[model samples]
Target: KLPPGWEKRMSXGRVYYFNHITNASQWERPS
Candidate 1:
């Protein structure tokens, strides 16, 4: 499952995750 406050999204051809609390995005999955 995604980390708390984190959402999953897709762009280009890959999966990316973003944080709602901080409004930050990353290529790595939340651990």
Candidate 2:
């Protein structure tokens, strides 16, 4: 969970990033 234009992610003990917008989140991943 996060605030507008602010976010974070954790999955399988790993980390990721995201952004809050339009009442939803935009997820991002590393290559």
Candidate 3:
């Protein structure tokens, strides 16, 4: 589970960066 105040700190800009990282990692794995 996420830590306390984690979601609050994850603003839209942070979310976009997170999504980009997720996509990059997924693409690298491709499985």
Candidate 4:
């Protein structure tokens, strides 16, 4: 699973991620 404050989103078959703390969104998960 992803880290805290990180949200996992799915559209069709593509998965994405978002960070609430930084208000950033990306196609890859953050480390």
Candidate 5:
């Protein structure tokens, strides 16, 4: 879940997830 008042951002008119240090280290949209 997201934090309070946190707006979701998207790119190319679609939601995309970037690789982060936490969870997985893959560069793909989050499940």
Candidate 6:
């Protein structure tokens, strides 16, 4: 489960997501 446009992506090692509108590889780290 993610936001609206957040998609699971593996970046080297750390698993992160990105936005479509902003296209920034940034997201609030899970708590």
Evaluate all candidate structures by whole-model CA lDDT and list the values in order: 0.88, 0.54, 0.29, 0.85, 0.44, 0.65
TM-score of 6: 0.45
- C-alpha-based local distance difference test score of model 3: 0.29
lDDT of 6 by residue, 1-31 (tens): 6666666677787777776656766656423
lDDT of 4 by residue, 1-31 (tens): 6788799888599988988888889998778
Query: Where is model 3 more than 4 Å wrong at Cα?
Result: 8-31
Residue pairs clashing, model 4: none
Residue pairs whose backbone atoms clash in candidate 1: none
Q: In model 3, what is the error at residue 4, expressed in angstroms?
A: 0.5
Q: Give RMSD (Å) of candidate 1 vs. truth.
A: 1.1
Q: Order the numbered candidates by TM-score, best leading.
A: 1, 4, 6, 2, 5, 3
**TM-score of every prediction relative to native:** 0.70, 0.37, 0.21, 0.57, 0.24, 0.45
Quote the positional error of residue 16 for candidate 2 in Å: 0.3
TM-score of candidate 1 versus the correct structure, residues matched by position: 0.70
- Runs in model 5 deviating more than 4 A are 11-31
Which consecutive 10 residues in model 3 have the weakest lDDT in total?
22-31
The CA lDDT at 15 in model 5 is 62
Lowest-sum lDDT 10-residue window in model 4 = 2-11
lDDT of 2 by residue, 1-31 (tens): 4444665677588666655554443456422
How far is 21's C-alpha from truth in model 4 (Å)?
1.2
Sequence-dependent TM-score of model 2: 0.37
What is the per-residue lDDT of model 3 for residues 1-31, given as tens digits with 9 covering 90 to 100? Answer: 4322222224355531123333322112121
